[PDB]
Amino acid sequence: NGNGDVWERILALLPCPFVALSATLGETQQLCSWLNRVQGRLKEQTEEMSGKMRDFEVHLLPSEGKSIQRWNDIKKYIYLPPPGAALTQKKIKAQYN
Amino acid sequence: KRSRDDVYRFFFTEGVISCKKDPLGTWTGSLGGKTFTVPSIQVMQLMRSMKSRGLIKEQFAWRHFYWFLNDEGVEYLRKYLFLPHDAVPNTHK
Amino acid sequence: KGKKKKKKVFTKPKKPIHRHKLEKMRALKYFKVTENDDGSFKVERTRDECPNPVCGAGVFMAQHKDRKYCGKCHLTYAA
């Protein structure tokens, strides 16, 4: 939906231990592999001294799995009027229905 | 509404024009000695526009209007009637 | 005195504004010219002028289906 290029520059470079924020994704591995790779390259360039601890990237997961959203139960339906109708029923009434 | 030219020729050799404030037509010198006749509203429109362009100096008293026309006025006129002048007041004195 | 703000009963066809109805190259539609005979050009007209002092110059009349007309002195010679 960008402009997904500028992002990548800032995920390659320099002490950012990073937290990043997403909803659901259908792809885990291909992405994460690239990430964790160039994380290990950050460690590599800092070596030989290593860091206070060395890069690694974790990738929150374990067992909930999109029952995060669940409890607000979004209920999807349609309007769909009968063939007739009046727009003139007008203003404050008991019941509109 | 092409009594314009006549009105402008009444201006030059006077420097002054006067008219009542009325919606019903009457001659705006009451005599010019050239015996022109114009409405009232038509006159009023002419001087109104030229006023906004800075060429006129306006005076109102009672139910009437007294129109004087500047140094600036003389310029505009001479170009429109394509004629030089020695000057309006020197001819009159 | 006192006052309010609202005017709209409305919701009809309102009037269009009158706007000029153009004829293009009006002179050439009146004056007619010919094949050249004797090296002299013969000029005729489909428009004939009205006989009144006001119209006495060049000022032509008109042509409708059921009437003839003069827009200058607002007259009718009826057909």
Added chain:
Amino acid sequence: MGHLEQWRSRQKIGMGKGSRHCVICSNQKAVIRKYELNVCRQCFRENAANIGFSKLR
């Protein structure tokens, strides 16, 4: 001819207490005067003499 003949007509006939209008302003309410054919009571006479009038009594 058309609209122009039907606009501003019935008091260029001149009738009633319309088409008066004071000399001093142009207001036609509060009586133009017909008394000795002066006009002043619509710019009020308290405001303006310079006609030679004064209250002596």
Added chain:
Amino acid sequence: GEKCTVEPEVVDSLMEDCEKEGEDLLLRALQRGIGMHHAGVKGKLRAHVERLFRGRHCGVIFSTETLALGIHSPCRSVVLAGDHILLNPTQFRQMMGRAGRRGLDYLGHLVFLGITMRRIKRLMTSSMTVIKGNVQMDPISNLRLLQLYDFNTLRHLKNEAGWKTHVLKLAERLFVNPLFFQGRNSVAGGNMEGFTVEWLQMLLGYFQREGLHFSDHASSLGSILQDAMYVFREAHVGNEGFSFIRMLTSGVFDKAHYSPLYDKKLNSGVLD
């Protein structure tokens, strides 16, 4: 409705602010517990709207995507009108993350008005949002990188090698794989990449010698300008042709030569 928390004086002051900034008669519409928000509303006043509608004053508010997109909002009953102008799976997935208020109610709902019973399917059904993300390799990036390396190279000694350590770690951390998707199937792989040292040479060689990379009157500038195509005259020989670090390394330790000054300065400062 009856339930409001907000005191009158609060409201009336905001309402006052509407009068002066009036535009679409946001004035009238807000006074009707009836509010709009999008980009065409000024930042100030649109914020003011949402302060009412988190306080419970207003009663629907009509917005465009941007609201639930980037901002927390209390909603229950959310409504959608047409698929116009462009509605996408991603956007349906956005709105569907919204509706219902935490611990107040356990419902919330959507209503599709309602031009199709077909297109609702083709949003709902098909799941997947994935990162198919874009490559960072670009000509302009590599000009920037050039002038970065050559920045402290201009007069300095110790500073050079210190900076050179830095630029090293930068340009090694960048162009590592990137090995995304579309790229693997472009005859690289499987699934490896790197490679890109050779690209950067081809680029570089073009870019110093051409005549009209300077400018009206022709190159030279500096006096050198060959040594670009010297590194092509090293690598492309055997292709070079297999390393991951050492040949990348070599590339960035070569690295001016003489590239064209006044023009590339004016590239980098149009983009900034």
Added chain:
Amino acid sequence: LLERHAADGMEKKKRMLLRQQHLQLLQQQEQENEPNQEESMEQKSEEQGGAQEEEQEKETVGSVSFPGSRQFIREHILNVLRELIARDMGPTIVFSFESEDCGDLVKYVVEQLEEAESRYRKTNEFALYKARIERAAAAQEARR
């Protein structure tokens, strides 16, 4: 099953409705277009086509049902909204994408509401309403 029966139901309804308006239109127009041919010349009291038509089709926003966009919509959007209120599911946010859209919607609704305010200036109940308040005010003033 049922959901689409009503959908396609009201769609097909609309289309055949349209055709019917083209029948009324066709015969209206037929008279407007002045064919002079039918040489009866007022020796028959039924002319300009036969029978049978002579119906009146409901107009609401130019028709009732209505496909697509920006006509259907707004007419009902007030009522969509209002039923979430009358079900007592409280507040809600409506989405339409920019620019002209959201403004047409909002505007139209302000219109409708201002409309219904005017109808209640037909003034019976509202009349007594004013009649009261005024009385109370006067009384208070007199007391003070």
Added chain:
Amino acid sequence: ATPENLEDALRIVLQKSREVNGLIRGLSEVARALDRRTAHLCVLAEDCEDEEYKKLITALAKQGEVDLINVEEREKLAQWAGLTKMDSTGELKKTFKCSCVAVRDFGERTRALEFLLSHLR
């Protein structure tokens, strides 16, 4: 002579008529002048296309015993009548292309020249 004498003298006498009202500018305006034979010194620009236009002019001008002169562009003719609106930047709003001037007045040195040219009857 020179064509300097031709066009510039024309432009001069032209100007003298514009500043007063001897001139007639237009189509049916010019035409109706020649029909009752009130015109004196007529002039024409031919660079037009609309056939005839031209034929009407020349026809009634000789038949009315009216002097006629011919010059080239209907461009330059326009700007010598000084029709054109040029604005704040001295650049176009409308710019006229105009044909068929009549004049009902006469010059002095430009008239003197026009005798010496002897252009038309």
Added chain:
Amino acid sequence: MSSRYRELIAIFGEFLEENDFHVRISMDRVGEVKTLFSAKTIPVESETEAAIEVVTIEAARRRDALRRTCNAVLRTRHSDQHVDVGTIVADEEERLAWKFLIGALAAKNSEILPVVEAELLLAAVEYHYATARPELCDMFVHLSASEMFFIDGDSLFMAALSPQSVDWDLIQPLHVIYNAQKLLYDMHCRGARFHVVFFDSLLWIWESAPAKLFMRENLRKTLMSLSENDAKVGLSISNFSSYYSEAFETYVKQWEPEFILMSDGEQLGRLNPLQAFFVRPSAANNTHDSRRKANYTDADEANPYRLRRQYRSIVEDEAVGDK
């Protein structure tokens, strides 16, 4: 600017009695003519459309479209003597030409009908094609390129035989179909498609070409995917017939909802063999569910088209379509 006037006067005065300048001048019957124009959904009237106009980005369009349609009409009915010949228009003319039409029909008492009818129909479909509406998208893989998507293979072939826009590289002796293989390996590879290709063939309204070009490829991909699997052959293909022609493709289109990828045009016109029978489906499409249309294209990421707007149902005619 009376020249133009006398020319249009000429050809009128030849075609019929001299002068339609005289009566009819108004009309009486104006609703007849004006009904006939806009029941075919071409732009005649606006002073209120939905409501009063913006007064010109709109009315300008409406005008130019109108009077140019009227030109097309006039350039038909002037036949029944000799071949079609052009017409010139600015303002006032429009009315001139308008009168010419009136007197034709009014006199001849419905000798007109099939010509102005056929013309105005054809012309209408051409307008409704190009009124129409360009976009630049992007995106291709999002909306589009999941679910059931089709491209009918005539269009496929003409995409492969397309390149000028680079005259085609690789000197081979007219085995070219590498194109097809390539495209399969583009949008299966990094797209979803669930893809279907029809070969609709024959469409045409032929010949001039060796015409080995279709049947070879038809039978080719049929054999590929039908083999059962082979890890290159899943797209998959069906047969049919009877060309295009509708009252058939309904049973398919319904069950399976779908969006669509298709080609008119470049160049190579010709008239009836290409532009005709490709254009007329686009119109068809919009009367329906609505299925929307793409392409060629001018590609990787993406292409044209059109889209989400209102339609006129029914309005039809195909009658070339040789089988």
Added chain:
RNA sequence: ACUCAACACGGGGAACUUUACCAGAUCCGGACAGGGUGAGGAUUGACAGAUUGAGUGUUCUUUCUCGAUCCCCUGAAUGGUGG
């Protein structure tokens, strides 16, 4: 206007006008041109028929007749017995 300093008071005895108020139609009295308009331009007025309370060109049909300021679009100006 409401105790004395409201209530044959507002020079207020109004048929139209006056006149604010109600139903309906008309006219620019929108200056100033920065932005658009070829010889036709942009433009003004109208007989007849129709619309209409109106033998009111308001508007349309029809054609004729005319300054190019009149005309078209934003800004601004203006007038008001509106507060």
